[PDB]
Amino acid sequence: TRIKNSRYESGVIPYAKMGYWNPDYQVKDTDVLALFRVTPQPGVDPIEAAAAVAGESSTATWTVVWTDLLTAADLYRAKAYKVDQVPNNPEQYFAYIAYELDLFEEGSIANLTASIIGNVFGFKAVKALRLEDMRLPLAYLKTFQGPATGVILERERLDKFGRPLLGCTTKPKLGLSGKNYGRVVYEALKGGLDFVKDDENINSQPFMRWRERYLFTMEAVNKASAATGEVKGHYLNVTAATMEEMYARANFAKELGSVIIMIDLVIGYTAIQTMAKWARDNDMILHLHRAGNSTYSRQKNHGMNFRVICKWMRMAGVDHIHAGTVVGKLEGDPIITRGFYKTLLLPKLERNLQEGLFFDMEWASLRKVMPVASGGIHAGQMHQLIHYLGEDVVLQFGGGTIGHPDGIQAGATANRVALEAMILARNENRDYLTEGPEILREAAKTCGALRTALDLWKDITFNYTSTDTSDFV
Amino acid sequence: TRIKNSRYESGVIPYAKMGYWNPDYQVKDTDVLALFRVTPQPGVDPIEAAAAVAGESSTATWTVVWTDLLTAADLYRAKAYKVDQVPNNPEQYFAYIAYELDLFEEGSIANLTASIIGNVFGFKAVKALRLEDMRLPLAYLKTFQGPATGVILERERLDKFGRPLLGCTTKPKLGLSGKNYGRVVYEALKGGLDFVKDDENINSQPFMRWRERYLFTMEAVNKASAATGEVKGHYLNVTAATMEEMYARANFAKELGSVIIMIDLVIGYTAIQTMAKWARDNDMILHLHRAGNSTYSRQKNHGMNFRVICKWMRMAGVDHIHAGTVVGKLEGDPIITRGFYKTLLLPKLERNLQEGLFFDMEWASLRKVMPVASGGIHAGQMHQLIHYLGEDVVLQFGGGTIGHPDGIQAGATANRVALEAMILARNENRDYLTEGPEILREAAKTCGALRTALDLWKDITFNYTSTDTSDFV
Amino acid sequence: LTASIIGNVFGFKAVKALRLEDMRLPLAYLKTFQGPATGVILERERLDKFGRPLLGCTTKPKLGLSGKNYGRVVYEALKGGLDFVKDDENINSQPFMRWRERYLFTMEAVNKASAATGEVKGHYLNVTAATMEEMYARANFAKELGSVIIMIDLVIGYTAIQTMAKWARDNDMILHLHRAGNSTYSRQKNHGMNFRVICKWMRMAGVDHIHAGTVVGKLEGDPIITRGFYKTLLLPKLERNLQEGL
Amino acid sequence: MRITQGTFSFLPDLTDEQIKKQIDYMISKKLAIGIEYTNDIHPRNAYWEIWGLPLFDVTDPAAVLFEINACRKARSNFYIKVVGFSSVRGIESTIISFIVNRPKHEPGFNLMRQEDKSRSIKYTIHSYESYKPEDERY
Amino acid sequence: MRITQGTFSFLPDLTDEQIKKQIDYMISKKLAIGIEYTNDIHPRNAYWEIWGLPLFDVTDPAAVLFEINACRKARSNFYIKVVGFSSVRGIESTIISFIVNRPKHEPGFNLMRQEDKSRSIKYTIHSYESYKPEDERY
Amino acid sequence: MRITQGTFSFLPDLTDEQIKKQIDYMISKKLAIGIEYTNDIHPRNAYWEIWGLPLFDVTDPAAVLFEINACRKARSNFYIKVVGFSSVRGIESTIISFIVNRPKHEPGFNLMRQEDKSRSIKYTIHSYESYKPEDERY
């Protein structure tokens, strides 16, 4: 007798008809925008698919519920407002969705992600789904901290400008003892590297508990500083099972004087945000290793594109983040990669279909995240590295240092000299990309360390077909 | 010069040659085993790919390093000991890899995943990669806590046995105030549901701050208890940006006497592990919403299969985890899903190629996790539900409850009656799968709400092709 | 915000007189603020009183009464029909009555008033004090005894007010703000700061109540100007209106 | 005693004509109209029992007055109130709630004074009728 | 009100026939069968009175039905339930518990709302019948 | 030893011609150019002695090179560096800093090891020359 008869009378109706599809919607400067790469099941109308993604990631459900009336439903419902066919693919479409600001909890990556990537990726009606880019609004971006230290403050604390930084992940990955670990750290830092680091999987294990590594490593870092006159640092990994344990390692790092520490993306968003606040509160540089990322970022048909993670992580307040190399061993298209670097460094982003940046985006003055290039690179590629990656980046040579036949110090010097020669040439306005090999050759004439390096990995290359590629090239 | 001449002299060599490929390797009961679905780049030797994944996720690096000599290298190297082609996909192969127990930090999901899924997914030489299954050894498992509560203790705290539990995610997902939220909670619990819950994205927003929801919701929960004579509860979502904020909400839940709380997978492994300990130390049931999971568990060619997540989360200590409704609106192949439930429920696990379980695995007496079926289900599928999902599970009807025309109490009663009716029939040894529609229409003769719910979603079905299917069907 | 906007300009020799009439706080800046700890809506929901103005009473005489006596007035006025009763702005802790007695006795009167009427009753327990520590101690005791509401004076300062707004938000308590001292700079038209500005700052700070004026009462209150203050505090959006002063 | 919850409980019980005008008011403000009741008038009993679903696009006050008299009939010895709900963005809550039916006699409340630390007291308010099972109240 | 503890309390009271079927089921799953009762249905009363020792190697459901009726005869106005216990290593707990006897009329429960800090409430649920001595309940 | 602070300290000391090119680069980046010096190369000594005021809208590298030499002449045995400051909103900081003069010989640093709690050490780095008054260093 009280049963309803209207839009809210019990029963199932298509999402496109529940208010989730509105091609006339005018985007508000306060809306959170998302761009998905939708692949609906055969037989499913893409508009209805986009609308299902818009519905299920905001306020809808598979059937009509009258409780909507008890809220400002017309405002809270997300709207799919645009659907374009993917350039050369009859099975994919780019769906633009707008979300009202009031839907999200201020400064929480977890809540942001809970809505955006909560259930939509498992919908049967949608054969494949991928989050390609997001437009975080100024007013929302202001509720976040942003990089704890930031590229500018970082360089000022390190007293190092106008040139990339150099680091090195200790090798072997696992297995080394504390005393020996520090040995490697001393040699590489004194040799010329700015940083040395624990591997993402180096925490606390039977072959080496963490406290010894911290002690010995700090002795190594200080000797190096005293042996070079530079502010040196080693990424002490505080990654652990619980927040209490992580705090225990970060605080010990703080007590011993470390300028920097590291964490793995695998700890999770909440732990990350917690650490980002800790770093801002404790004048520490916070390096983030993207462990596990490629698990959902590699393929072009499903998952999340790394540039979105770049936005979220810069918001969270992380100081460094492996954004990829272009000539290394890991996946990384040059143009898409330029996208990642811009997202982490620029104060404002501009739409660029080639780079995969679908939205213009102000950064509300949040500090800059320092990009890290690591995996498979070596001196000799320096011209390409500078050319693609630029000035603001940490060039990390793991085996590219320790592998040198004349010792760790030698490996490090080779990289440091290679790096400086190349940017001294850049500054001189030389076509260093072209003159590259010769520039290194001309520098190696004065440093045996470099000469050797240049011969060892002379033809070492990683040419393969990319998976994460542009659609407008 | 004191250079080298052997296996550790500077230089790059194939992975299969660095000691990462061994078809004769003898698996130790203490080893951690992994099964990867590998898609090598055209021109790459499957075996060399396997070995690469083996090396890159263990101790290897693109170039030899003599520092291996300072460790028991031969022991810390992971070894791919078996590689076979996937049944009907010549581009793919299943690769078994063994890791030394000493490689992992005890009781840490972060360290575990940092090694296993750290960088191998972004390797160029491998076009696609997916971690299909893991074999965690007793010795390692004993270092983890396991579910804080466990199905058994949970059932004893609720005093409800021999039948699935019933829940309902409040709808709309977002937009509702605290006062109105409590109204829904009272009505549904009172009508027959065992649980009601916050949606994964309901944390604390402008339209509703968390503390109000907690106070009103607890008033609603106790009223339902007094009105039914049952132990009732509501999943209070404590998901937040920082760990401190999460404790603050969990503690309030504990302060007000809630019997259960929930968190989103999106907070991260470290935050999850931290909360699992808190729930164990505070007698709280901890529900985990798989938020974001399908972001890497959907496609069959790349990512991580959900059962791996089931294993990591059971180890972590979660009490509930969404494991799918086979006939719901989200992906769910019946055989693959049966494996999900077994992983979470059984004390011993048996290899079954149809289910996707590639290893035999003792659970080391770790407690059982209560699987949760949620998404587009309604009364009328009850027979299919009991048949596919089983006795131990929480059937969650969100829209399938609140969408009832006779109100929320009625909607809940329909589900509660259908459930008991079907269980009663199952127990009476009847072939309920076949007699399902009858058993319901039969019980519906005595319950209007049920009848009403049966006519409303009679035709509603979500039949689509499965993306994650067995390779041995 | 205030340090920049009103830090020095008002004492600049070259400017004979200056008055901050209004400000437009950007949306992106407003999100960095908490806003009312409780808010009108949730407040009416915790009181179960809608569709009508609420009723209060400031105990009189302003000073001099004892705790025991203070509770007498509270009980009588609540049971009589008022929704609230309150400590006067200058009632804190003094020789004629220390705060703890007042809190103890008043809470008894409140609970009696609730039992005698079937309504949720409350008494603004004033936690205004010299230091933050002391204020927390008073606020926390009110929290302990179950008070549904407390009050503070604008005279404690912006930082103490913001500290309290957070506390009230985190402890499910209604936060009432008495404009103590406001007219000291908001009365004249040629120099000072217009009250609608303070209304905005205070709404941003997170206070739950604020004296915004009576038009026909004993205190300054132009009907149109006052209407401006009210909208500034209630409306979800403000519209330019020269007649009001916005 | 007289329960004074509700917007007009200090005034005499409203006539159906007065109730009618209050409905016209609610209608004029585009509100959802709900009818509720209980025999547990604790001021903190936020969720009274609901009478059917709320009446949404009401235009004819007689339709509402109808249910009100229907509920009165089915719950003579219960408290019954009418509630007006607003969906406007900044409100999304009740903006009116008044009593439309009271049992003949209201015993009142019992107050418990549990002695805690020092002079502190943990209070408990409970209606006398609530000490009996529902079907035996009023 | 109807106490809905028990696996089938939303369905009508089971017949001896249906109970016999449930016993077959329990027997098929090698469960240890016990009978318990109380006149205090507080949802948190984990320890009902036990009717003798639990029947272990049950082969004939009549033996169980006999005691169920024997208990009924002795505690006619008490709630009576049957429990199935599993000793399988990972379980070692009840895996089914259903009502086989209800008193004639159930008053329901009383809800105490003790006001603690701020808006917090410490609740206490108590059956109206439990306010009387056992020999005088139902 | 050789102090490696500065952007190109791993390359041979720059020639006035090479320096001239760097000044070109700075000019193109619309940077402000400053000249600073000290005889206390402690890496944490963030404030070297400033040489006059920074040069702002520079168009001729020779002008800058003039002061670099003017300073070299006045501070033969001091470290001297050229700094490039950017004022772009996001940067507002030094974006290049290189050495343009070193004393004839650098003794290096002393490393104090003050034993603290357990195995922890509170370190102190100090140049051997800094142990001498300014007018006697290098």
- The gap between the terminal CA atoms of chain C, to the nearest Å, is 19
Rg (CA), chain B: 25
Q: Do C and E touch (≥3 CB pairs < 8 Å)?
A: yes
Instruction: Fill in the amino acid letter for F138.
Output: Y
Instruction: Fill in the amino acid letter for F37.
Output: Y
- Residue B290 annotated in ligand binding: yes
Domain harbouring B102, CATH code: 3.30.70.150
Could you tell me how far CA B342 lies from the centroid of its own chain? Answer: 11
What's the full length of chain A, in residues? 473
Q: Residues of B with CB below 8 A from C44's CB?
A: none
Helix (H, G, I), strand (E, B) or coil at A138: helix
Asked if B78 and B55 touch (Cβ cutoff 8 Å), the reply is yes
Q: Helix (H) and strand (E) counts for chain F? A: 2, 6
Q: Is the dihedral of CA C41, C43, C47, C52 positive or negative?
A: negative
Instruction: Please tell me which of the candidates E21, E41, E120 has its beta carbon nearest to residue B256.
Output: E120
d(CA A20, CA C80): 52
As for how many domains chain A has, the answer is 2
Q: What is the DSSP letter of A142?
A: T
Nearest to A423 by CA among A383, A371, A396: A383
Asked if D39 and D79 touch (Cβ cutoff 8 Å), the reply is yes
Edge-to-edge strand ranges of the sheet holding A93-99: A79-85, A93-99, A32-40, A126-135, A303-304
Domain harbouring A286, CATH code: 3.20.20.110
Asked if B178 and B402 touch (Cβ cutoff 8 Å), the reply is no
For residues B219 and B364, membership in a common domain is answered with yes
Q: What is the DSSP letter of C154?
A: G
Strands A126-135 and A32-40: antiparallel
Asked if A93 and A84 touch (Cβ cutoff 8 Å), the reply is yes
Asked if A296 and A304 touch (Cβ cutoff 8 Å), the reply is yes
Against chain C, the chains showing at least 3 CB pairs within 8 Å are A, B, D, E
How far is residue F114 from each of residues A217, D63, F119, F120, F124, measured CA to CA in Å? 17, 87, 10, 9, 8
Q: Which residues of D touch C (CB under 8 A)?
A: 1, 3-5, 7, 10, 41-44, 46, 84, 89-98, 108-111, 119-123, 125, 127
Q: Which residues of E touch C (CB under 8 A)?
A: 115-120
| DSSP states of B108-135 | -HHHHHHHHSSSGGGBTTEEEEEEEEEE
Nearest to F38 by CA among F7, F8, F83, F85: F83
Shortest alpha-carbon distance between residue F21 and chain A (Å): 6
Structure tokens at A332: 């990384």
Q: Which residues 6+ apart lie within 8 Å of D126 measured at CB? A: D42, D109, D110, D112, E112, E113
Determine whether the interchain pair B229/E3 forms a contact, defined as Cβ–Cβ distance below 8 Å: yes
How far is residue A450 from each of residues A413, A445, A457, A458, A471, measured CA to CA in Å? 7, 8, 11, 12, 40
Asked if B423 and A20 touch (Cβ cutoff 8 Å), the reply is no
Query: For this structure, is C79 an active site residue?
Result: no
Q: Do E and B touch (≥3 CB pairs < 8 Å)?
A: yes
| Helices B382-389 and B432-444: angle between axes, nearest 10 degrees | 140
Q: Does any CB of chain E come closer than 8 Å to the CB of residue D47? A: no
Nearest to A178 by CA among A144, A211, A135: A211
Structure tokens at C53: 């103005």
How far is residue B291 from each of residues B167, B267, C24, F120, measured CA to CA in Å? 18, 9, 39, 43
Marked catalytic residue, from C123, C178, C200, C209: C178
Burial of C36 (0-12, 13-18, 19+ CB in 10 A): buried
Which residues does chain B break after (C to N > 2.5 Å)? none
Instruction: Fill in the amino acid letter for A297.
Output: S
Helix/strand/coil (H/E/C) assignment for every residue in F111-135: EEEEECCCCCEEEEEEEHHHHCCHH
Q: Does any CB of chain E come closer than 8 Å to the CB of residue B362? A: no
Could you tell me how far CA E64 lies from the centroid of its own chain? Answer: 15
d(CA A446, CA F12): 9
Asked if A242 and B274 touch (Cβ cutoff 8 Å), the reply is yes
d(CA B452, CA A61): 19
Nearest to B166 by CA among B428, B461, B418, B384: B418
Structure tokens at B388: 């596919």
Structure tokens at B431: 């072939």
Interface test with B, best of D38, D47, D85 (most B CBs within 10 A): D47
Asked if D56 and D76 touch (Cβ cutoff 8 Å), the reply is no
Structure tokens at F80: 């001297």
Could you tell me how far CA A217 lies from the centroid of its own chain? Answer: 27
d(CA A315, CA B456): 45
d(CA A83, CA A86): 9
For residues A45 and A156, membership in a common domain is answered with no
Give the 3-state secondary structure percentages of chain D, helix then strand then coil, rounded to 5: 25, 30, 45
Tokens 């502010």 belong to: A231
Structure tokens at B341: 């439930």
d(CA A77, CA A65): 13
Asked if B318 and B369 touch (Cβ cutoff 8 Å), the reply is yes
C236 to chain D: closest CA residue: D90
For residues B211 and B261, membership in a common domain is answered with yes
Q: Which residues 6+ apart lie within 8 Å of A332 measured at CB? A: A324, A325, A326, A466, A468
What's the full length of chain E, in residues? 138
Nearest to B43 by CA among B91, B85, B86: B91
Instruction: Classify residue B187: in a domain, yes or no.
Output: yes
Q: Residues of D with CB below 8 A from B220's CB?
A: 46-47
For residues B269 and B315, membership in a common domain is answered with yes
| Helices B306-316 and B269-281: angle between axes, nearest 10 degrees | 40
For residues A244 and A344, membership in a common domain is answered with yes
Q: What is the DSSP letter of F64?
A: H
D123 to chain E: closest CA residue: E115
Establish whether the linkage from the previous residue to B147 is cis, with ω within 30° of 0: no
D91 to chain C: closest CA residue: C41
Tokens 């010792």 belong to: A407
Q: Do D and C touch (≥3 CB pairs < 8 Å)?
A: yes
State phi, psi for D5 to the nearest 5 degrees. -75, 165
d(CA B157, CA B283): 10
Nearest to A284 by CA among A150, A194, A412: A150
Q: Where are the beta strands (DSSP E) in A5-63?
A: 32-40
Asked if C128 and C153 touch (Cβ cutoff 8 Å), the reply is yes
Nearest to A415 by CA among A381, A461, A373, A458: A381
d(CA B222, CA B190): 10
d(CA C77, CA C56): 9
For residues B307 and B251, membership in a common domain is answered with yes
d(CA A366, CA A405): 44
Instruction: Classify residue B6: in a domain, yes or no.
Output: no
Strands E32-38 and D121-127: unpaired
Q: What is the DSSP letter of C151?
A: E
Shortest alpha-carbon distance between residue F70 and chain A (Å): 24
Alpha helix positions (H), A285-398: 294-297, 306-316, 334-345, 382-389
- The gap between the terminal CA atoms of chain E, to the nearest Å, is 13
Asked if A36 and A81 touch (Cβ cutoff 8 Å), the reply is no
Nearest to D34 by CA among D5, D56, D1: D56
Print the domain residue range for B24: 17-144
Nearest to A83 by CA among A125, A123, A36, A41: A36
| DSSP states of B254-317 | HHTT-SEEEEEGGG-HHHHHHHHHHHHHTT-EEEEE-TTTHHHHS-SSSEE-HHHHHHHHHHHT
Neighbours of F62 (CB within 10 A): 9
Determine whether the interchain pair B420/E11 forms a contact, defined as Cβ–Cβ distance below 8 Å: yes
Asked if A132 and A35 touch (Cβ cutoff 8 Å), the reply is yes
For residues B137 and B214, membership in a common domain is answered with no
d(CA B199, CA D133): 35
d(CA B374, CA B168): 9
Could you tell me how far CA B305 lies from the centroid of its own chain? Answer: 10
Asked if B164 and E9 touch (Cβ cutoff 8 Å), the reply is no
d(CA B258, CA E28): 37
Shortest alpha-carbon distance between residue B198 and chain D (Å): 19
Query: For this structure, is A234 an active site residue?
Result: no
Give the 3-state secondary structure percentages of chain C, helix then strand then coil, rounded to 5: 45, 10, 45
Asked if F113 and F121 touch (Cβ cutoff 8 Å), the reply is yes
| b/e per residue D36-45 (b: at least 16 CB within 10 A) | bbbbbbbbeb
- The gap between the terminal CA atoms of chain D, to the nearest Å, is 13
Number of A to C CB contacts under 8 A, please give it: 16
For residues A306 and A426, membership in a common domain is answered with yes
How far is residue B118 from each of residues A330, B54, B276, measured CA to CA in Å? 12, 12, 24
Question: F1-138: which CATH topology?
Answer: Ribulose 1,5 Bisphosphate Carboxylase/Oxygenase (3.30.190)
Strands C84-86 and A233-237: unpaired
Strands A260-264 and E93-101: unpaired
Determine if residue C2 is left, alpha or beta; phi over 0 gives left, psi from -120 to 50 gives alpha, anything else beta.
alpha
d(CA A258, CA A244): 19
d(CA A252, CA A235): 13
d(CA E72, CA E79): 9
For residues B92 and B27, membership in a common domain is answered with yes
Per-domain residue ranges of chain D: 1-138
Which H helix or E strand runs over C111?
Answer: helix C99-117
For residues A182 and A60, membership in a common domain is answered with no
Nearest to B411 by CA among B460, B445, B377: B377
Helix (H, G, I), strand (E, B) or coil at E99: strand
Tokens 């402000």 belong to: F32
d(CA A216, CA B136): 33
Structure tokens at A42: 């055969």
Neighbours of A17 (CB within 10 A): 11
d(CA D117, CA D99): 39
C79 to chain D: closest CA residue: D4
- Residue A290 annotated in ligand binding: yes
Asked if B105 and B273 touch (Cβ cutoff 8 Å), the reply is no
Q: Which residues 6+ apart lie within 8 Å of A230 measured at CB? A: A159, A160, A194, A224, F4, F5, F43
d(CA F81, CA A200): 38
Could you tell me how far CA B6 lies from the centroid of its own chain? Answer: 47
Q: What positions of B carry a catalytic annotation? A: 171, 289
For residues B101 and B215, membership in a common domain is answered with no
d(CA A101, CA A103): 5
| DSSP states of B177-242 | -HHHHHHHHHHHHHHT-SEEE--TT-SSBTTB-HHHHHHHHHHHHHHHHHHHTS--EEEEE---SS
Alpha helix positions (H), B69-108: 73-76
d(CA A241, CA A248): 12
Structure tokens at D40: 């547990």
Determine whether the interchain pair F111/A222 forms a contact, defined as Cβ–Cβ distance below 8 Å: yes
